[PDB]
Design a protein around this ligand. Sequence first.
Ligand code: MCT
Ligand code: MCT
Ligand code: MCT
Ligand code: MCT
Ligand code: CA
Ligand code: CA
Ligand code: CA
Ligand code: CA
Ligand code: FE
Ligand code: FE
Ligand code: FE
Ligand code: FE
Lengths: 314, 314, 314, 314
Amino acid sequence: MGVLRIGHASLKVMDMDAAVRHYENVLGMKTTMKDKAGNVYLKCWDEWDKYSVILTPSDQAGMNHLAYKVEKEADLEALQQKIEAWGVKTTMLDEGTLPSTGRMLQFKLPSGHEMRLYASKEFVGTDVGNINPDPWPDGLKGAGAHWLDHCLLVCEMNPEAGINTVADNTRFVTECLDFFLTEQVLVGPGGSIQATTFLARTTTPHDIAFVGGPTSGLHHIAFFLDSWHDVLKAADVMAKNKVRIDVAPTRHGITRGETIYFFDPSGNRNETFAGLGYLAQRDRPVTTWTEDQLGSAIFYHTGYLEPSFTDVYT
Amino acid sequence: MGVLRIGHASLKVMDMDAAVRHYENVLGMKTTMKDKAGNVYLKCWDEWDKYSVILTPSDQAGMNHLAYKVEKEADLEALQQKIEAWGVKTTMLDEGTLPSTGRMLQFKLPSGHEMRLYASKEFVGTDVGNINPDPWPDGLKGAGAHWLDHCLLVCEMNPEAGINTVADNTRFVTECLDFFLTEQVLVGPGGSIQATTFLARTTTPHDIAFVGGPTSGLHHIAFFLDSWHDVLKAADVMAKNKVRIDVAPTRHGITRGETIYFFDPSGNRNETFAGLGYLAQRDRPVTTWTEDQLGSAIFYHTGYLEPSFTDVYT
Amino acid sequence: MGVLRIGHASLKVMDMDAAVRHYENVLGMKTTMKDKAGNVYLKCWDEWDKYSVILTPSDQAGMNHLAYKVEKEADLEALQQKIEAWGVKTTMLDEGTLPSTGRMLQFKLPSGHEMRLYASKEFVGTDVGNINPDPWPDGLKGAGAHWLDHCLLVCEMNPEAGINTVADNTRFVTECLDFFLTEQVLVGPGGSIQATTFLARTTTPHDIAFVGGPTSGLHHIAFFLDSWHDVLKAADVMAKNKVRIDVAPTRHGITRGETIYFFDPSGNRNETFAGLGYLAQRDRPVTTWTEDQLGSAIFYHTGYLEPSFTDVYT
Amino acid sequence: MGVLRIGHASLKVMDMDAAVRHYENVLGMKTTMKDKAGNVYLKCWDEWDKYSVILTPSDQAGMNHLAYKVEKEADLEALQQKIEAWGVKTTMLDEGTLPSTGRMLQFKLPSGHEMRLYASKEFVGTDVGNINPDPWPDGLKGAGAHWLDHCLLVCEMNPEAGINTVADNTRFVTECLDFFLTEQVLVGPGGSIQATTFLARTTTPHDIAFVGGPTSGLHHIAFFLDSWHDVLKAADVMAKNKVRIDVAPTRHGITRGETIYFFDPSGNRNETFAGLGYLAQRDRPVTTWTEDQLGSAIFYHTGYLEPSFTDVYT
Ligand SMILES: Cc1ccc(O)c(O)c1
Ligand SMILES: Cc1ccc(O)c(O)c1
Ligand SMILES: Cc1ccc(O)c(O)c1
Ligand SMILES: Cc1ccc(O)c(O)c1
Ligand SMILES: [Ca+2]
Ligand SMILES: [Ca+2]
Ligand SMILES: [Ca+2]
Ligand SMILES: [Ca+2]
Ligand SMILES: [Fe+3]
Ligand SMILES: [Fe+3]
Ligand SMILES: [Fe+3]
Ligand SMILES: [Fe+3]
């Protein structure tokens, strides 16, 4: 029972034509529907539900909400009682609040982000089918991202004021949603302060992650790639589209995943994440990264924490 | 709760010196202990428990038993009641039956194979540690296999006699151990007969798999590799050790995983399995492979079902 | 001065529609022209001359002739005098004998194959241009082969009758065309008989190669790929087109190149050759492969000389 | 006849122990000899001559000289007459001027760099041999660089003063040493000024290259890697040794080669260059890169010319 994976992310974009061009040409997604309000919904080729990305017209960038899919409809009631016992108020938007989407349990994380849980979304199938399917589909576009993999949220953190929503989010998703912690960045005196956590429901290194910041926001949403070679191909695609690259191809110390950071035409950061990294397990010890090696935990090859990583978000 | 992953596999070897040489030099495992009976225990570098391979002196090849790790000790009692309600008798070997191994729930699958469930095994840690760890360890040997990934069992099947232990094993591990079916090979009239199934507890395409055969035996145990390039490196290692290769580097249609089939110095087949393939999910539709494309489901590149795949096992 | 690289290969095909489909869909070539006689000319994306493959309607498979490009027009006269001093008669087909092709020096190798040398062919340019070009072109098809890389000729060999056209071809292209020998397979007593030679004009392991056989024929023409990953992608393409694969992805012991052997719809063998292998140099010692390791020289991963390699050619 | 490839590069290092540690542990070279003056000579595993790197104790970084190997001893006299007719004075250091090195033709390029040509250097062979050799050697260290691939020289350039040693070096190595130009960066009004040139003797995109600068110096010496995956492995090695990385893994627009820029413990820049890129040919059109796309020619993925590329050299 419970959460299966990340379901979709709703982003604010300032130019819908350019944003749809970016997520279709660079990452290889397909527009699946547009509702009466101009919101655009997109999915990756190796996803089977209707959409994993919502683009909403706005005056600014940023994230509206973040959604995770649960196994069955009855999970929402059980998780709702666990969440509300913890002290977080929930509400239940019923079927059709979003198009092709069942009812959704809605609540705010301690960091202030809106999170939704749904059990039902319209099935459309992957772009390779499920009867004698090919490993990849013909006519893939751009980077050919498999699926929306995870999301990193910037969480308000002020240790001198006693505020650490990374720690409160980590305790919330573990005790209420039964995520398990895979890796953590420990800063402060002797690593006594959680500044970055990576948690999972799948057996991948992370499906959600929290990083500390002055305010709460969206650091990036990530899309899965198979291999290091696909990261090279994805980097070539971004050059052909003059995509503004935040971080050139390298490897993360955390999760061991190979990565590229880049921006959409509204400022939202995206990531092409490559490789399984390792099989995350509930009996696996939590990988601890210390403050003296803070740069190697994020950008392993250089050991150099980019100022853009900890200063630019939406 | 319940099963986490494959725990270890106990194999029969006829030359212990040569078998240990093979699993250390070719696959890159390390011998962790040898008990008073001459049994040798080995682990991969990206595993943290004491051992994932047992080599036992024998007059023949084959598999002794297959073990899976569960999350907590209390899972064994709950799973024991589920298994025994289904009709399978179980027994409980207590701590120390195997060295550095907790108590084990022991039972036979419908196919006749002995399966064990344990919650506790001595922790030793991965070869890269858990404090600011490197992505890979220095001084890796051979193929540098990450971990024991899965096991494919040959299961007695006789449709004209009404015998299909692949179907009975599939129903058993789903209803009792809460595995979920990811892919299946359907043969017979209109694909009405399950001849090969792939089931998972992790979010990888399979942790266990059953293939039909005249008798029940071991088809292969598999070890995980990161990328297609590592399959090339692994193939070079097998050439340097004159390993007898069953199937040269290619891709599986099922799981999309890139693979090599090769034998140990006793005849047991091993596999170097590369890539995640896809994120297995309980809401994902079961990939069905039909009998007309039976060759592409196993060896995707050629569409040619090797006679060795369906004729050679131990 | 002298030969630069392989220029084109003229093949006999029995079904022109199917052969053009194969070389366009599988290898990614483009049809550039068709002459009044129905001959079809094709080029790869990373070639700049008009064509590197000629498909001629025929009752059988096989090779018509093999062409190499020289640096300048005056090279033909100088090479003609060297060839005719050696004892081989030459002729000069003038401009337009083939469409978009300058004059051609025509002669027969000792093995009986017809070889042509030309200095001029119509320039069309690569599919990425030469002003701020992309590393690869958008809309590549199939395997996306870079260029016609080399050709392996089967050469009549009968040591008990004193016939070895592999040795005579090797001495001819070295003494007359100034190729240099990179690797050789030595069989017979103590490796006293050249059964396979690899010779180069570029600094790649081979631009031409000769292998012994009962008769003289075409073993395969090869096309260059970048990496091992592209060999995986090429193998996936052959599966999607149900291409009959001769040899699944593996590595050659000679040249160190990763490879796939496959057939066109007429029986002619093709190869997708990946990697530089090494920088061939005239001061580099000739790599010698002995008869006891004959299988590893061809198919390095298995050490198993496929019967198809030495028995099937056109 | 003439130049075959780059032969060796003599570098100034300020800490010999640390420099030897770097070139052995990071790039995987082996120390082959040390002369009476403390100079250390190193070679890569896929080279067969005695050394390709000279480390000389000095108070500063920088390059002493650059050496290229010619095919035969008589080439030195012929090239000497061509060079001296052009207007450059030469001298001939005889055998043993450098240990295990034949006589050397010595002269200065128009940019002021000292270049040497030799025909004879002590043969030691590659680390895999030449009789049934493995594709790679067991016990490779670090990145496992194949060979010294090329060298990029910073050349004094002052267009308002009428000084462009990149253009004078390009004309010199073409007219005297018979290099051929593969790619060029054109700046100034309408691309009328050569600011960067890439020239070759092999059929690889470049064996020497010149880039304009305020003074003449050494930009980097490069070492060849096979694939993009090896660049990932090389980047992991630099992290394990806390190598100061200039440019993280990316692709060059010129040559299409994948690359990493990093420094030795004296400040000299090194490069791990991956891939053939393309087959350089004397009939291939020169790839022209314009000033508006100057960033994409160097760092293709970002289109962002690093300030370090054009500001840091020794
Ligand atoms: C440090 C890190 C690891 C993995 C990620 O996906 C990411 O965004 C950051
Ligand atoms: C068909 C198949 C797919 C994946 C495997 O690991 C395997 O052994 C077989
Ligand atoms: C033995 C070998 C090596 C390289 C080739 O291209 C080939 O066809 C055969
Ligand atoms: C632009 C460029 C291309 C290739 C190289 O090796 C290099 O140093 C620079
Ligand atoms: Ca994930
Ligand atoms: Ca698995
Ligand atoms: Ca070639
Ligand atoms: Ca070169
Ligand atoms: Fe991420
Ligand atoms: Fe398997
Ligand atoms: Fe070939
Ligand atoms: Fe370079």
